[PDB]
From Swiss-Prot:
ISGylated. Homodimer. Identified in NR3C1/GCR steroid receptor-chaperone complexes formed at least by NR3C1, HSP90AA1 and a variety of proteins containing TPR repeats such as FKBP4, FKBP5, PPID, PPP5C or STIP1. Forms a complex containing HSP90AA1, TSC1 and TSC2; TSC1 is required to recruit TCS2 to the complex. The closed form interacts (via the middle domain and TPR repeat-binding motif) with co-chaperone TSC1 (via C-terminus). Interacts with TOM34. Interacts with TERT; the interaction, together with PTGES3, is required for correct assembly and stabilization of the TERT holoenzyme complex. (Microbial infection) Interacts with herpes simplex virus 1 protein US11; this interaction inhibits TBK1-induced interferon production. It comes from Homo sapiens. This is Heat shock protein HSP 90-alpha. It comes from the Eukaryota. It is found in: Nucleus; Cytoplasm; Melanosome; Cell membrane. ATP binds at residues 36, 78, 97, 123. The lineage of its organism: Eukaryota, Metazoa, Chordata, Craniata, Vertebrata.
């Protein structure tokens, strides 16, 4: 049972700008997704300070980067707070309508796409490199869900029957054909060292057979 939703017009406009603007510095998508994971991990950590049972769904707070050249996917996994179904539908837990408004004003007033995270909509930078994004998520207060979008104005949400996650979020980037450098170990390591050196959770880059 799959539900299909229209993006709000402002979010569809954001996504088309990300996909269509000529902008070479695409590697910042990974910094933005790692930053979102860190924020989600901070949230569950804070809740656990007054209620240890919040970690019954998993005590480890970490970020995993999983490249898969056969599937042409890069997956970013975190064990943060996760998202409810309502969060997924409401722009993956963001205030994306107001954030987009500000971001697009900044772009006309000098800024560039790399600054997207300052507007709370850094998730959508995934579309710099991915033709399709799948988000699998599990929040303590809800069931496990899969969100997916290839842009084009719509997204889907369904209950996820796949491998149970415990708690957190998995962002699966189905990479564009010309963006496979982001599956190479040395390239990922370079990006993490350049942009994510001060993230306060372990970031493990998985290797492939
Ligand atoms: C990730 C990203 C990439 C591009 C933009 C952006 C902003 C304004 N434009 C179009 C223009 O050049 O006027 N494109 C925003 C975010």
């Amino acid at each position: 049972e799959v539900e299909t939703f229209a993006f709000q017009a402002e979010i569809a406009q954001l996504m088309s700008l990300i996909i269509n603007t000529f902008y070479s510095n695409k590697e910042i998508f990974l910094r933005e997704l790692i930053s979102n994971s860190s924020d989600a991990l901070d949230k569950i950590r804070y809740e656990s300070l007054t209620d240890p049972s919040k970690l019954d769904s998993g005590k480890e707070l970490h970020i995993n980067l999983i490249p898969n050249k056969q599937d042409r996917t890069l997956t970013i996994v975190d064990t943060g707070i996760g998202m409810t179904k309502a969060d997924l539908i409401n722009n993956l837990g963001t205030i994306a309508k107001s954030g987009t408004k500000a971001f697009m004003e900044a772009l006309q007033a000098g800024a560039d796409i790399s600054m997207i995270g300052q507007f709370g909509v850094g998730f959508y930078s995934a579309y710099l490199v991915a033709e399709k994004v799948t988000v699998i998520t599990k929040h303590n207060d809800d069931e496990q869900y899969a969100w997916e979008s290839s842009a084009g104005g719509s997204f889907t949400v369904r209950t996820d029957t796949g491998e149970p996650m415990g708690r957190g979020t998995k962002v699966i980037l189905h990479l564009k054909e010309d963006q496979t450098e982001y599956l190479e170990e040395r390239r990922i390591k370079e990006i993490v060292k350049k942009h994510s050196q001060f993230i306060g959770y372990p970031i493990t880059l998985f290797v492939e057979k």
